Paper text:
Gasdermins (GSDMs) are pore-forming proteins that play critical roles in host defence through pyroptosis. Gasdermin (GSDM) proteins consist of an N-terminal pore-forming domain (GSDM-N), a C-terminal autoinhibitory domain (GSDM-C) and an interdomain linker. Recently, GSDMB was shown to exhibit direct bactericidal activity through its pore-forming activity. Shigella, an intracellular, human-adapted enteropathogen, evades this GSDMB-mediated host defence by secreting IpaH7.8, a virulence effector that triggers ubiquitination-dependent proteasomal degradation of GSDMB4.
To understand how GSDMB is recognized by Shigella IpaH7.8, we determined the cryogenic electron microscopy (cryo-EM) structure of human GSDMB (isoform 1, Q8TAX9-1) in complex with Shigella flexneri IpaH7.8 at an overall resolution of 3.8 Å. The structure shows a 1:1 complex with the IpaH7.8-LRR domain binding to GSDMB-N. IpaH7.8-LRR organizes into a slightly curved solenoid structure containing nine LRR motifs capped by two N-terminal α-helices (α1 and α2) and a C-terminal α4 helix, together with a parallel β10-strand that directly augments the β-sheet of LRR. The predicted β4 strand (in reference to the GSDMA3 structure) was not observed in the density, whereas the α4 helix protrudes away from the GSDMB-N to contact GSDMB-C. In our structure, GSDMB-C traps the protruded GSDMB-N α4 helix through a gigantic hydrophobic groove formed by helices α9, α10 and α12 rather than by helices α9 and α11 contributed by the subdomain in GSDMA3, resulting in an even larger interdomain interface in GSDMB (3,020 Å2 total interface area in GSDMB versus 2,745 Å2 in GSDMA3). In the GSDMB–IpaH7.8 complex, six out of nine LRR motifs in IpaH7.8-LRR interact with GSDMB-N, resulting in a total buried surface area of about 1,826 Å2 between the two proteins, with key interaction areas divisible into two patches, I and II. Meanwhile, the positively charged side chains of R186 and R228 in IpaH7.8 form extra salt bridges with the negatively charged side chains of E15 and D21, respectively, in GSDMB. Interestingly, the side chains of E15 and D17 in GSDMB insert into two small basic pockets formed by R186 and H209 together with the surrounding residues in IpaH7.8. The two pockets are approximately 10 Å apart, suggesting a potential mechanism in which IpaH7.8 recognizes a specific motif containing two acidic residues at this precise distance. In our complex structure, this fragment corresponds to the α1–β1’ loop in GSDMB in which a motif of three negatively charged residues (α1–β1’ motif) interacts extensively with IpaH7.8.
Residue numbers in the entry:
A (entry chain C): 3 to 90, 115 to 217, 247 to 406
B (entry chain B): 22 to 264
The structure:
């Protein structure tokens, strides 16, 4: 998505690679902004900021009579005007909005509250979180056309494909929008190489079924075709993992009857397996349209087999980067596609 | 008779316009902008190619994205001169009333003297090859995206200074006589190799994003020596880790 693209660009030009991180959720543009604390390193893949009903008021909600002046003191947010300009002359008009160090001090010397939401206890299990301090809003409707770029995961285009396509994707940005947000941490006042992993999963998932799998494929069509349904099925599957039960109103019911095995017993291996899928696939940012296309195609075997040669070339970097340090994102995409069709085909061919 | 001249010269400049402008709306705006002399006197998006003589009682001027031709005298103003994306000519001398000047996205190649206690400067997106002395009361600087290569001294209350993507070859003789909560000193994408010995002398209440500059390996490895060491208590300087 260009949101990812143009917000990466504004990060790089305005302040390259600092604590001001882009927004990748295209449709979820201004859900989070100044005074919207979403975020946790809650066993995520390093660079993740979950879209949850927890925002800054929902974590640190003052409940006294002095709220009326807290309206002014809280929407005091800055509207300083920046001109972002490159060879995308042209000047996109951004507003920097940074809650001042004085309010940072007041929040530090204040204390949290008692009735918090269930989402808090669901997400903050092992969360080393970050909070939005400086955010980049859009002041004027800024529908701007753009195409694409990436790096050297162009080995796909080296194999037999050519990748000569055109990303004429022109997303609309209305006024009062969001581009990027500075992240800083107030964490809580206490108030196998995946080939062998994937061999184990290949057994426990060769254990799968056909029609249940076809619902898997349709459900992943909606999920990993458009952004929104990805977080939909993400929340659903995470709830399946934690609660370990079933609500019979799930559109993903045959995969539920699949993760729960043919006898209806939840194979935790299958649950963590769809989870490692979703991790690898959401690591493939905006690959959603392409994977919905791939369901329509039935040509995942082609995709992986290409990056199968490519993965067996690239085992240098997920072993070079320790699991707790920053990986190579391109190599993560690579191993992700291995995981994609390795499993998905060992699945799609009957048990 | 004075209002009579302004009316008639405005009418001439309105009806001898080469016929491509919203200057009828600009004209009734100027009739209500001299008759009663409204504040703000906004000219934005009206595309007035040439701004004629303004009334004496002006308060704040806001004329973004209007012109290509030089401004006339701005004689006695009051607060905000906001002249974005207009022309390349020189700025008229600022009066004692002017405290905020935003000439962002303009094309002035020679910023003139900026006397008096000017507070809020925003001269981003210009071709300033030079910059004279800045006022002491300067507090929010923005020389962002400018061609200056010989950045002079800094004031003693500057907090946010954005001067990235300039031809700055040398980190200047820094005014680290400033003690702002977090120095937003964005110098990324400059031509710097030489670092003045005083990087051990600035406080940790600093982020100088010195990225993009072609530092020498020795100074870079000294920076690694102070950063990989767990006791980094100098400025929180983000160096260009191949960013």
């Amino acid at each position: 998505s260009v949101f990812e693209e143009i917000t990466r660009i504004v990060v790089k030009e305005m302040d390259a690679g600092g604590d001001m991180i882009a927004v990748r959720s295209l449709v979820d543009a201004d859900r989070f902004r100044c005074f919207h604390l979403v975020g946790e390193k809650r066993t995520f893949f390093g660079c993740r900021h979950y879209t949850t009903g927890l925002t800054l008021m929902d974590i640190l909600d003052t409940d006294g009579d002095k709220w009326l002046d807290e309206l002014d003191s809280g929407l005091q947010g800055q509207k300083a005007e920046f001109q972002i300009l490159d060879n995308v002359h042209q000047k996109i008009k951004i507003s920097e909005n940074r809650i001042s160090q004085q309010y940072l001090a007041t929040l530090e010397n204040r204390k949290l509250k008692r009735e918090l939401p269930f989402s808090f206890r669901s997400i903050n299990t092992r969360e080393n979180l970050y909070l939005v301090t400086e955010t980049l809003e859009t002041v004027k409707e800024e529908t701007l056309k753009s195409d694409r770029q990436y790096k050297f995961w162009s080995q796909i285009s080296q194999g037999h494909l050519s990748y000569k396509h055109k990303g004429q994707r022109e997303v609309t940005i209305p006024p009062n929008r969001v581009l990027s947000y500075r992240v800083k941490q107030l964490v809580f006042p206490n108030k196998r190489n995946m080939k062998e992993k994937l061999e184990d999963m290949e057994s426990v998932l060769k254990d799968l079924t056909e029609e249940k799998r076809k619902d898997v494929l349709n459900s992943l069509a909606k999920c990993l075709g458009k952004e929104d349904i990805r977080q939909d099925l993400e929340q659903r599957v995470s709830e399946v993992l934690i609660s370990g039960e079933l609500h019979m109103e799930d559109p993903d019911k045959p995969l539920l009857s699949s993760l729960f095995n043919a006898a209806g017993v939840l194979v935790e291996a299958r649950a963590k397996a769809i989870l490692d899928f979703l991790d690898a696939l959401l690591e493939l940012s905006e690959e959603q349209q392409f994977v919905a296309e791939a369901l329509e195609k039935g040509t995942l075997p082609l995709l992986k087999d290409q990056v199968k040669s490519v993965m067996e070339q690239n085992w240098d970097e997920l072993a070079s980067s320790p699991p707790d340090m920053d990986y190579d994102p391109e190599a993560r995409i690579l191993c992700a596609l291995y995981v994609v069709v390795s499993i998905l085909l060992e699945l799609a061919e009957g048990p | 008779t004075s209002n009579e001249h302004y009316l008639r010269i405005l009418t001439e400049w309105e009806k001898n316009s080469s016929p491509g402008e919203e200057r009828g709306i600009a004209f009734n705006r100027l009739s209500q902008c001299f008759q009663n002399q409204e504040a703000v006197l906004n000219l934005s998006d009206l595309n007035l190619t040439s701004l004629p003589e303004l009334p004496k009682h002006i308060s704040a001027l806001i004329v973004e994205n209007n012109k290509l031709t030089s401004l006339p005298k701005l004689p006695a103003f009051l607060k905000e001169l906001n002249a974005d994306n207009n022309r390349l000519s020189v700025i008229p001398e600022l009066p004692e009333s002017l405290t905020t000047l935003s000439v962002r996205s303009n094309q002035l190649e020679n910023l003139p003297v900026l006397p008096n206690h000017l507070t809020s400067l925003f001269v981003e997106n210009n071709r300033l090859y030079n910059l004279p002395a800045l006022p002491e009361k300067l507090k929010f600087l923005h020389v962002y995206y400018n061609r200056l290569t010989t950045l002079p001294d800094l004031p003693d209350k500057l907090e946010i200074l954005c001067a990235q993507r300039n031809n700055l070859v040398t980190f200047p003789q820094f005014s680290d006589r400033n003690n702002i909560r977090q120095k937003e000193y964005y110098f990324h994408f400059n031509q710097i190799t030489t670092l003045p010995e005083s990087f051990s002398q600035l406080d940790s209440s600093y982020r100088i994003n010195i990225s993009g500059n072609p530092l020498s390996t020795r100074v870079l490895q000294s920076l690694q020596r102070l950063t990989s060491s767990p006791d980094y208590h100098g400025p929180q300087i983000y160096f260009s880790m191949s960013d």
